[PDB]
Subunit: 204 residues, 2 copies
Amino acid sequence: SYYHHHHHHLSDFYDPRERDPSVSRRPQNRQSDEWIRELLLRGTIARVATLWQGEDGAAFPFITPLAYAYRPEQGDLVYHTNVVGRLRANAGQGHPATLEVSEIGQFLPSNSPLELSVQYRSVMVFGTARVLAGEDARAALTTLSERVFPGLKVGETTRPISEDDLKRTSVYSLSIDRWSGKENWAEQAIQEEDWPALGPEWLG
Amino acid sequence: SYYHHHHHHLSDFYDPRERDPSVSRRPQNRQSDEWIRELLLRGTIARVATLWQGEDGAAFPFITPLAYAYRPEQGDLVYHTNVVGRLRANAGQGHPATLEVSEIGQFLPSNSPLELSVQYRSVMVFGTARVLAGEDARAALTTLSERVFPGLKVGETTRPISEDDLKRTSVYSLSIDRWSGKENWAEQAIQEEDWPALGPEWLG
């Protein structure tokens, strides 16, 4: 900055910058519904959080990483997992679930400590999960399988999904109520001009 | 299998196998406390789930991906995030938090549909998170920064963390109560001998 330069020889916010007009003007790094849909379509791993009753009676969340598939027409995501707790912290045949999908890029170095960051794109989905049965479960497991193993075809590449298979597996449909999308994927973190610039080790 | 082979020309569980005696005999893919510690020490990204009060009064979990650092002596994990909801679903200055760290490897193809899987190592930590202030916050942010940017040194590579920095950042210590460790990192999924084997496209 001038003040600092001048002091050696002896604000930013409102001053000129370049802006691409094609860029999202949404606050807090938020993204469009279309962007959310497309990120969900290309991901294969999510974390799901659901609530279980703990020792003290209080609900608490599990976090499970797992394979998933977004089914846009049905308005849900499907996954399978045999992870459970004792009792769910919930009344009903379905349970509230939060699902997160992200693309995590590189850590971005800076000479300004609070500008250190990591590149990310991240969606949170809020909805209700329910266990599927019979042909609903078979179809969901097939869609899942054929999504995350591109080119695999159940019944050809694999034997068909049997009744025994279904008995041994908990397959869920998380029906979407709402979702959130967030991106900060800058190429470089903001740097502090009035401190020695990062060396070539960091940015090259 | 014999039965199938013989039928073409016209159980597994209790029969001989190889076992390495050095391998974990823990059920359900569980791992030792030492293994958990070391996985936490080498990771840099976690998801944290905490409970927020929703529209219907009911608590529900957020899932936030973020940079973290395990501090073994203090018995906590540190991270920073300005993500919040409206009101936390919790009484106190601290809040219950679940933190998950994983190493996700490759999807493992099979000719048996319910043997399709993904390689993973995964830890869940259960504890109480609290906001840090002043030099506690500065020290935690420094440990975090210098952990996830190896070779970076706050005060040299970067300018020091200022009071303004701290005012603008929510830095947390998640004090560990319990943790869980899980690994299934086989080289190949279990295959079905009585269905055509996967082609070289899949396993080669």
